[PDB]
Write a protein that binds this ligand. Structure first.
Ligand SMILES: [Zn+2]
Ligand SMILES: [Zn+2]
Lengths: 56, 90, 148, 116, 146, 56, 288, 102, 72, 98
C-alpha cells in the first residue's frame, strides 16, 4: 500500500491482522480482509460452476 | 490556496499517504482500543482525508463494518439495493 | 460516543568589454535569397567545402460527377517539393533532407569585417548525409541473397 | 564483448584471423579498414549474471521520500544518515542483501557479513 | 527403497546421484573464447600451470570455460569424468583439457582440427544444452523424506 | 480477562520478535534455504508459520 | 432529493453505465510461456487524441527462446504482411550506420549485454545497408497494390510518415523523432529481456480509462455525423447528375441523428460490439 | 552554375524567445571577455550563452531534376542561445495559459 | 489559535464542503456538460467540409461546410 | 468510493509550450553521449524531449499545479529509477482528493 515504506518485509505490512473483531480493524487490514473475502466468494462460485458440470 | 490535491492511481505510486492526521504526523494505552502502526516514516507527502471514505454508497449504511467480516458487508451491500423505503416525495 | 448533531447552537454561540551594434538587412536581399541551414552526418569533424573540392554542384534531383477530398496550403507546397538536392563534384556525394522541427526560432548573426553583425531569419534547415562512400548495392541480388 | 566500430563506416569490427603474422585483427567487411588486436579475448557469455542488482543509482537518490532511512554509519565517512534498498536485479534466486547508500559521499556499501 | 538398505542417508544420496538429471550448463559460471594460434603455447599467464601439467595441426581458436566449485559439490562431479564425457561425446575432432580439483579456479579448454569463432559458438550451445553429466531424463529435485 | 489479553499481547509480541530476527538474518544473508525452495520461499514459510503459531 | 444524472426515453429512466477500457500510447511488454518462438512482445496501441479513432497497434517481437543463440528482433508494421527487423526499419527512417542505431537503442556504452544481444540484428542490418534498398524492401514486402516500384517506394515512405506511429504527428520530416521513440521501445523490450524489469502489469488501475456519456456520445455522434455528411453529399451528386433543382429539406435529414441517438440511448447497444450499457433506473430505494 | 562565394564568413546561430523573434519577423551586443549581452533599443539586455563552442560540419547557403541558382554563404562559427523587469515576462508566460474557446 | 493543527473529527467538515460542491453524482453531469459544450463543436468542426467535383466540356465545383452548432 | 471522480481531459498544448521556455531540449537534438544524465519528459506518452534539470522544473510545475493554473485533474508522475516523468491529462482516469 502507498502508506508504508518500500522493501518492507515486516509481517504487519505484509498482511498480518493483529487486531481482533472485538476492538475493530485498521484500514490496511480491512482492505486485505476484503481481498480475502472476495477471493473466497470467487473461489466458491468457480467450485460450484465446475461442480455442476462434473455432476452432469 | 494549495491545501488539497487530487491523486489518481498513477501518481499514487510516487506518494506516501498517512491515515489519521493527529496520529501519524506528530512524533512521540487502553486495552480496548485497536493496535495501530508506528510513525517511523518521515517523508509523508500526503494524508488521507478519512479512511471511511474508501467504502461505497451501499457499504456506508453498515454500522461498525470494521467489527464485521467482509462477506457480510458484501451481502448487506447487496440487500441494500432492494429494501423498501421512500425514494422520492413526488 | 454519539453523533454530535447540536453543532448549530455551538457555532452560533461561538461565532574588457566590446560593444558592437546589430542591424536588420533590408528586405530586398531577403526577397532575393532564402537562407537555409546545413548539417552533415558523417561524424568526421572537419569536412569543409574547400576540401569538398570542385566543381561543387548543389541541384535538386469516362467518369460522371464525382467526389474530391481536400488539402491545405503550406503542407501542399512542401509536399510538391519532394525532390531533395545533392552536392557533388564531377567523387563525393552529399544528399540532404528536410528537418522541419528545427524551424521555430533561428536567427543568424553573420559576422562581417567590422565588429557589427547582420541578423537574418532562417527559412528552413536541412540535414546533409554523405552518400555512396563504399559504393555497392544489388536490389534483387540482395532479395535472393537474403533467402539463404 | 566491448567491440569497436569502424571509421567513417561506423560498422562493427568483425574479428579477422591474420595467418601471415599469425595474430588477431579487427576488420570491417564493408571497407578495407582493419586495425590490430590489443587482446585475444573475443566472446564472453557469462551465464550466472550478478550485475544489475544495484541498477538505477542516481545522484538525486537521496531526495526520494518513498525510500526508507537507516541509522547505520558508513565505513568511509562514518555518516549515520543513509538510504538502503535491496538488489535491483529482479529474479527468483536473487538474495535479499541490503544495499546501503550514504547521503554524504554517495558510497554504496552493502550489509553482507559473509562476503564483502 | 529396499528393506535391506532402509533408514540410510548415504545410500539414498547415491540413488539420488544416480537418477537426478544434471547438465554441463548447471556447473558453468561463464565461458569465454580466445584467439591462441599456437596449439601448445598459451598467451594466458595463469593457465600456464595447466599448460605445464596437462600436456606432458589444430584450430588457432580456443574455447574456454569456468565451473562453480559449489556446483561440483552439490552435484558430485569430477573434472576428469566431465572431460571423459565430452571426449566420448565429440570423439576426436575436439581436443580437450580440464583443470584440477586442487585448482582454486576451475578451467576447461578445447580446440578443433570461414572464421573459427562461429564453429566454436555452435559447439558452445551443444556443450551447455546437449550434454547431461549424470542421471536419467526428466528427473529433478529429488527430496529425501522420512 | 486482562491477564489473558496481556498473555495474547506477549504471545504475538514474541512472534514479532521472531519474524524480526529471521528478517535480520535474511537481510544479512546468513540463512541458507533447504532443498526444493529458495530463500524467499523458506523465509515466507517461516514467517507464516510463526504468525499462525502465535494466532493458534 | 432527486439526484438526476440520467436520461428519459419513451417515459423510461435510462442510465448509461460507466464502461471500462485500457489506455493507449503506452509501451507495454509481456512474456510468452507458450512454445511459440517469440519470447517477449512489446505492444503499444497507438491512437490520436481526437478524431478517426485509430485502432492500429505496433508490435515489436523478440524471436528465440532463452538459452538458444541467434535471438533476432522483428517488429510488425501495419499494412505490411510479414514482420520486418528493427534495423531495416531504422534504415528506412534515414539512419544508415549501425553505431548510431546502437546509440539510439542502448543509451549506456558501459553495458555490454544489450549491445551483445543486438549483434544478430546488426548482421541482418549488414545484409541490407542502404536506405533506398530498405524503402524498396518494405515496398516489396507488404502492400502489393502499388504494382509500380517508383510508386511503392514513395508509397512506403508515406506509410512510414503517416500510418507508422499515428501519435506524435503524421507530417513529413519527423523520422528522427520516431527513430528515437522506436529505439526507446527496443530498449524497453531488451531491457525487459535481461530480467532487469518485471512484466508490465495490466491490473494497475491507473492504466485503465473509464468512459461516461462524454466519450460514448462522442463516438456515436461522430459516426452519425459522418453518415450525415456522406448522405448529404450523395444527395448533391444525385442532384447535379440527374440535373434537377436543389432543396434543403431533402438533402439534410434529421431522422439519422434522431434515430441514431434515440436508438442508441433507447436500446442496450451503442451502435454487437457493446451491450448492456443502458439500464433502467432502479427505484427500490434511495441508496439503490 | 553553383558557385561558392566565400564560406569564409562566420555566422552565429541564435535560438531567440518567441516575442522578440516574432518582433524580428535593433540592438548592440556587448562582448565581455566569456560572458556577452545585448542592449536592445528602447529595451532589455540579454546574456547569450555559448551553447556549443565547437560547431563543425555546419554551414549556411542561399538559393536564388531541375537545377536552380545556388550560392554558398559562410561557415557556422558558434552555436548560441539568448537567455533573458523579468516579472512582467513571467506574468506574460503565466498569462498565456488562459486560452479558451466559445 | 488559527495556526493550530486540525484533529480527526474536524476532517468531516472538509468532506461536507466536498459534497456541497460536487454532489453524489457529479461525474455524469460534468462529463455530459463538457460533451455538450466542446464535443459537439469538435465533432462538427473536425469533418464538416465536403465538396462535389463537377465536370463539363469547363470544370466546376461545389462545397458544403458546417460551422457553429446550436443547441436548444 | 464516495469521493472518487472521473477526469474529463484538458489541453496538453499550453504545458508543452511552457516546458520549452525553461530549456527543454527537443528530442531531435538529443545525443546520449553529450547528455547521458538527461531526464526524459513524456506528455501523454509522447516523447517531446529531455531536460537536464528535472528538480527545479518539477518544483515549478508542482507549485504552478497547486496554485490553480494547471487543471488539478492532470496527474504528473516522476519515476526516479525509470528516469522518466509521465504526464497524464487524458479523460477517463479516476482520482481522489487528499
Ligand atoms: Zn568500414
Ligand atoms: Zn558515506
Amino acid at each position: 500500500l502507498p502508506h508504508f515504506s518500500k522493501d518492507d518485509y515486516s509481517p504487519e505490512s505484509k498482511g498480518f491482522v493483529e487486531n481482533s473483531y472485538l476492538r475493530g480493524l485498521t484500514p490496511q487490514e480491512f482492505f486485505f480482509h476484503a481481498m480475502g473475502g472476495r477471493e473466497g466468494l470467487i473461489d466458491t462460485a468457480v467450485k460450484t460452476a465446475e461442480t455442476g458440470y462434473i455432476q452432469r | 490556496e494549495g491545501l488539497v490535491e487530487y491523486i489518481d492511481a498513477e501518481e499514487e505510486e510516487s506518494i506516501l499517504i498517512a491515515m489519521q492526521p493527529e496520529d501519524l504526523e506528530p512524533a512521540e494505552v487502553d486495552p480496548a482500543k485497536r493496535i495501530r502502526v508506528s510513525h517511523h516514516a518521515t517523508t509523508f507527502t500526503h494524508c488521507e482525508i478519512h479512511p471511511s471514505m474508501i467504502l461505497g454508497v451501499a457499504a456506508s449504511i453498515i454500522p461498525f463494518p470494521d467489527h464485521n467480516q467482509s462477506p457480510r458487508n458484501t451481502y448487506q451491500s447487496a440487500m441494500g439495493k432492494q429494501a423498501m423505503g421512500v425514494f422520492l416525495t413526488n | 460516543f454519539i453523533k454530535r448533531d447540536r453543532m448549530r447552537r455551538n457555532f452560533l454561540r461561538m461565532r574588457e568589454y566590446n560593444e558592437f551594434p546589430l542591424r536588420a538587412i533590408p528586405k530586398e536581399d531577403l526577397e532575393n535569397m532564402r537562407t537555409h541551414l546545413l548539417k552533415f552526418q558523417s561524424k568526421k569533424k572537419i569536412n569543409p567545402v574547400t576540401d569538398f573540392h570542385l566543381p561543387v554542384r548543389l541541384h535538386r534531383k469516362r467518369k460522371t460527377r464525382q467526389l474530391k477530398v481536400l488539402d491545405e496550403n503550406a503542407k501542399k507546397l512542401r509536399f510538391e517539393e519532394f525532390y531533395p538536392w545533392v552536392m557533388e563534384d564531377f567523387y563525393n556525394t552529399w544528399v540532404g533532407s528536410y528537418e522541419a522541427g528545427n524551424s521555430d526560432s533561428y536567427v543568424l548573426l553573420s559576422v562581417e569585417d567590422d565588429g557589427s553583425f547582420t541578423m537574418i531569419p532562417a527559412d528552413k534547415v536541412y540535414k546533409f548525409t554523405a552518400r555512396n562512400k563504399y559504393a555497392t548495392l544489388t536490389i534483387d541480388e540482395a532479395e535472393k541473397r537474403m533467402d539463404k | 564483448t566491448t567491440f569497436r566500430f569502424c571509421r567513417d563506416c561506423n560498422n562493427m569490427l568483425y574479428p579477422r584471423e591474420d595467418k601471415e603474422n599469425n595474430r588477431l585483427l579487427f576488420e570491417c567487411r564493408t571497407c578495407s579498414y582493419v586495425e590490430e588486436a590489443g587482446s585475444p579475448l573475443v566472446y564472453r557469455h557469462e551465464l550466472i549474471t550478478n550485475i544489475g542488482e544495484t541498477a538505477g543509482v542516481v545522484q538525486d537518490i537521496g531526495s526520494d521520500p518513498t525510500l526508507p532511512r537507516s541509522d547505520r554509519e558508513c565505513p568511509k565517512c562514518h555518516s549515520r544518515e543513509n538510504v538502503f534498498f535491496q538488489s535491483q536485479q529482479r529474479r527468483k534466486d536473487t538474495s535479499m542483501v541490503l544495499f546501503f547508500v550514504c547521503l554524504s559521499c554517495s558510497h554504496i556499501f552493502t550489509s553482507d557479513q559473509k562476503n564483502k | 527403497l529396499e528393506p535391506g538398505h532402509a533408514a540410510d542417508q548415504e545410500q539414498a544420496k547415491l540413488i539420488r546421484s544416480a537418477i537426478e538429471h544434471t547438465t554441463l550448463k548447471s556447473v558453468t559460471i561463464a565461458s569465454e573464447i580466445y584467439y591462441d594460434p599456437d596449439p601448445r603455447s598459451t598467451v594466458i599467464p595463469e593457465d600456464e600451470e595447466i599448460i605445464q601439467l596437462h600436456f606432458s595441426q589444430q584450430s588457432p581458436w580456443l574455447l574456454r570455460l569456468e565451473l562453480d566449485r559449489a556446483a561440483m559439490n552439490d552435484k558430485d562431479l569430477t573434472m576428469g569424468q566431465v572431460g571423459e564425457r565430452i571426449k566420448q561425446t565429440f570423439k576426436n575432432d575436439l581436443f580437450v583439457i580440464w583443470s584440477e580439483d586442487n585448482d582454486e579456479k576451475l578451467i576447461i579448454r578445447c580446440r578443433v582440427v570461414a572464421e573459427e569463432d562461429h564453429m566454436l559458438k555452435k559447439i558452445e550451445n551443444t556443450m551447455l544444452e546437449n550434454i547431461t553429466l549424470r542421471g536419467v531424463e526428466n528427473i529433478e529435485r529429488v527430496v529425501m523424506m522420512k | 480477562d486482562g491477564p489473558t489479553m496481556r498473555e495474547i499481547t506477549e504471545t504475538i509480541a514474541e512472534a514479532k520478535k521472531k519474524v524480526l530476527d529471521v528478517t535480520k538474518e535474511a537481510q544479512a544473508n546468513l540463512l541458507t534455504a533447504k532443498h526444493g525452495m529458495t530463500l524467499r520461499e523458506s523465509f515466507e514459510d517461516n514467517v507464516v508459520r510463526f504468525l499462525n503459531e502465535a494466532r493458534d | 432529493f432527486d439526484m438526476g444524472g440520467y436520461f428519459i426515453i419513451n417515459g423510461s429512466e435510462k442510465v448509461l453505465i460507466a464502461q471500462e477500457r485500457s489506455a493507449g500510447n503506452i509501451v507495454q511488454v509481456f512474456k510468452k510461456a507458450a512454445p511459440s518462438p517469440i519470447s517477449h512482445v512489446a505492444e503499444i496501441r497507438s491512437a490520436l487524441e481526437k478524431g478517426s479513432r485509430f485502432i492500429s497497434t505496433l508490435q515489436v517481437k523478440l524471436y528465440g527462446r532463452e538459452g538458444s543463440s541467434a535471438r533476432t528482433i522483428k517488429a510488425t508494421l501495419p499494412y505490411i504482411k510479414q514482420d520486418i527487423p528493427i534495423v531495416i526499419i531504422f534504415r528506412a527512417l534515414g539512419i544508415i550506420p549501425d553505431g548510431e542505431i546502437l546509440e539510439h537503442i542502448c543509451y549506456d556504452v558501459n553495458d555490454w549485454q544489450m549491445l551483445e544481444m543486438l549483434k544478430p540484428c546488426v548482421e541482418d542490418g549488414f545484409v541490407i545497408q542502404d536506405r533506398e534498398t530498405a524503402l524498396d524492401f518494405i515496398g516489396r514486402r507488404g502492400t502489393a497494390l502499388g504494382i509500380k516500384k517508383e510508386k511503392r517506394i514513395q508509397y512506403a515512405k508515406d506509410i512510414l510518415q503517416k500510418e507508422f506511429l499515428p501519435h506524435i504527428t503524421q507530417l513529413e520530416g519527423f523520422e528522427s523523432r520516431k527513430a528515437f521513440f522506436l529505439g526507446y521501445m527496443i530498449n524497453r523490450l531488451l531491457l525487459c529481456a535481461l530480467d532487469r524489469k518485471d512484466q508490465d502489469d495490466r491490473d494497475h488501475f491507473g492504466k485503465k480509462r473509464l468512459d461516461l456519456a462524454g466519450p460514448l456520445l462522442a463516438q456515436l455522434f461522430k459516426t452519425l455525423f459522418k453518415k450525415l455528411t456522406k448522405d448529404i453529399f450523395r444527395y448533391m451528386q444525385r442532384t447535379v447528375e440527374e440535373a434537377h433543382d436543389f432543396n434543403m429539406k431533402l438533402a439534410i435529414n434529421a431522422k439519422t441523428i434522431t434515430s441514431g441517438l434515440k436508438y442508441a440511448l433507447a436500446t442496450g447497444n451503442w451502435g454487437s460490439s457493446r451491450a448492456g450499457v443502458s439500464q433502467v433506473l432502479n427505484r427500490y430505494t434511495y441508496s439503490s | 552554375d553553383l558557385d561558392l562565394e566565400r564560406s569564409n564568413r562566420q555566422v552565429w546561430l541564435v535560438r531567440l524567445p518567441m516575442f522578440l523573434a516574432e518582433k524580428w519577423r535593433l540592438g548592440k551586443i556587448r562582448i565581455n571577455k566569456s560572458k556577452i549581452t545585448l542592449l536592445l533599443n528602447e529595451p532589455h539586455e540579454y546574456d547569450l550563452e555559448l551553447t556549443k563552442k565547437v560547431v563543425e560540419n555546419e554551414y549556411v547557403f542561399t538559393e536564388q531534376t531541375i537545377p536552380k541558382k545556388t550560392a554558398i554563404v559562410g561557415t557556422v562559427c558558434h552555436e548560441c542561445q539568448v537567455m533573458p523587469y523579468h516579472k512582467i515576462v513571467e506574468q506574460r508566460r503565466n498569462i498565456v495559459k488562459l486560452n479558451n474557446k466559445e | 489559535d488559527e495556526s493550530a493543527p486540525i484533529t480527526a473529527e474536524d476532517s468531516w467538515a472538509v468532506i461536507s464542503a466536498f459534497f456541497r460542491e460536487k454532489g453524489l453524482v457529479s461525474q455524469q453531469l460534468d462529463s455530459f456538460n463538457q460533451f455538450v459544450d466542446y464535443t459537439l463543436q469538435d465533432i462538427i468542426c473536425e469533418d464538416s467540409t465536403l465538396i462535389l467535383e463537377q465536370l463539363a466540356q469547363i470544370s466546376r465545383k461545389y462545397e458544403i461546410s458546417f460551422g457553429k452548432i446550436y443547441v436548444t | 468510493s464516495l469521493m472518487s471522480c472521473i477526469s474529463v481531459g484538458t489541453d496538453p498544448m499550453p504545458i508543452i509550450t511552457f516546458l520549452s521556455e525553461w530549456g527543454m531540449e527537443p528530442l531531435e537534438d538529443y545525443v546520449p553521449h553529450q547528455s547521458p544524465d538527461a531526464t526524459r519528459v513524456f506528455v501523454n506518452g509522447v516523447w517531446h524531449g529531455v531536460h537536464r534539470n528535472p528538480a527545479r522544473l518539477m518544483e515549478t510545475l508542482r507549485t504552478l499545479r497547486r496554485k490553480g493554473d494547471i487543471n488539478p485533474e492532470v496527474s504528473m508522475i516522476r519515476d526516479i529509477r525509470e528516469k522518466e516523468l509521465k504526464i497524464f491529462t487524458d479523460a477517463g482516469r479516476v482520482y481522489r482528493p487528499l
